[PDB]
Design a protein around this ligand. Structure first.
Ligand SMILES: COc1cc2c(cc1NC(=O)c1cccc(C(C)(C)O)n1)CN(CCS(C)(=O)=O)N2
Length: 288
């Protein structure tokens, strides 16, 4: 953990080059709170998050998420969480520096962005167990993520799942209702802050993992992935019809076992949902 010159981060990202790595630029992805650039510092490839209000948030609310992420992650080293290497606040923009995740986001690999080969059912099961172990660590330390989704699950050199984005990290009620609507529990939309919302959001991730479909697709009927889950439960559809066809190693038993965990996670009444420990156990028994 260090403080970095804004100019070092500016320099090693080719002046925050917004062109893709494919074109030859430095932009790897973006979110509601800024753009992720590929950089090289301390003889290592790194990820540089340049923070900016790409959405209706205050510049002080941006600075809150910056300080909040540093407070939570500065000294954190878990197998299934991203590692923060440092920050920059001495220049034009606020920057967070992380250990580079070569295989990017679960979202991107599920969509096969840039022509990457589809993830095997084997890799998917290990990723699900990884992410859950990452969430368990947060919940054990009485932290609520508040934005669990496939874009906030990153993949290292061995496709180990790392949870990312702790700007919003925190039964309790709030007036500022923040998150990703495609993933959000009903009570989270009403402004509740509970780890039970994280479980619901994880349910949607498991659906993404089983189906290979994004949580929302404006060109799709239905548009929201959690409505496909509802339709399955009302027997209007079946899980077999929606299992990602881009796998050769998926067996109905383990797929339906994962769907079972997802379905329990997506109970609309938060108190009916399993806790993360119970999700971990059920995902363990799935591969036994
Ligand atoms: C979107 O963020 C990334 C995208 C991509 C890659 C890395 C990242 N991101 C991080 O490495 C990182 C680490 C920690 C934290 C974060 C934040 C998000 C800032 O929280 N990001 C790599 N990559 C190439 C994949 S390929 C060779 O299969 O085509 N795409």
């Amino acid at each position: 953990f260090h403080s970095f010159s804004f100019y070092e981060l500016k320099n090693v990202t080719n002046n925050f080059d917004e062109r893709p790595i494919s074109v030859g630029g430095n932009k790897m992805g973006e979110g509601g709170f800024g753009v992720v650039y590929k950089g090289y510092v301390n003889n290592t490839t790194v990820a540089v998050k340049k923070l900016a209000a790409m959405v209706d948030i205050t510049t002080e609310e941006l600075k809150q998420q910056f300080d909040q992420e540093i407070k939570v992650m500065a000294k954190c080293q878990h197998e299934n969480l991203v590692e923060l290497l440092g920050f920059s606040s001495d220049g034009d923009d606020l920057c967070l520096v992380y250990v580079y995740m070569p295989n990017g986001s679960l979202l991107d690999r599920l969509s096969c962005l840039d022509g990457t080969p589809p993830l095997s059912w084997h890799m998917r099961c290990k990723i699900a167990q990884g992410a859950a172990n990452g969430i368990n660590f947060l919940h054990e330390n009485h932290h609520i993520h508040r934005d669990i989704k496939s874009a906030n699950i990153l993949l290292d050199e061995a496709f180990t799942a790392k949870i990312s984005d702790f700007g919003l990290a925190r039964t309790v009620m709030t007036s500022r209702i923040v998150g990703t609507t495609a993933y959000m529990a009903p009570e989270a939309l009403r402004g509740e802050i509970t780890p039970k919302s994280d479980i619901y959001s994880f349910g949607v991730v498991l659906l993404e993992i089983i189906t290979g479909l994004p949580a929302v697709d404006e060109h799709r009927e239905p548009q929201l992935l959690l409505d496909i889950a509802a339709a399955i439960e009302d027997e209007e559809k079946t899980i077999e019809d929606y299992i990602d066809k881009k796998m050769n190693d998926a067996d109905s038993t383990s797929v339906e076992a994962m769907y079972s965990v997802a379905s329990q996670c997506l109970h609309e009444k938060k108190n009916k949902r399993p806790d993360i420990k119970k999700v971990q156990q059920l995902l363990q028994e799935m591969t036994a």
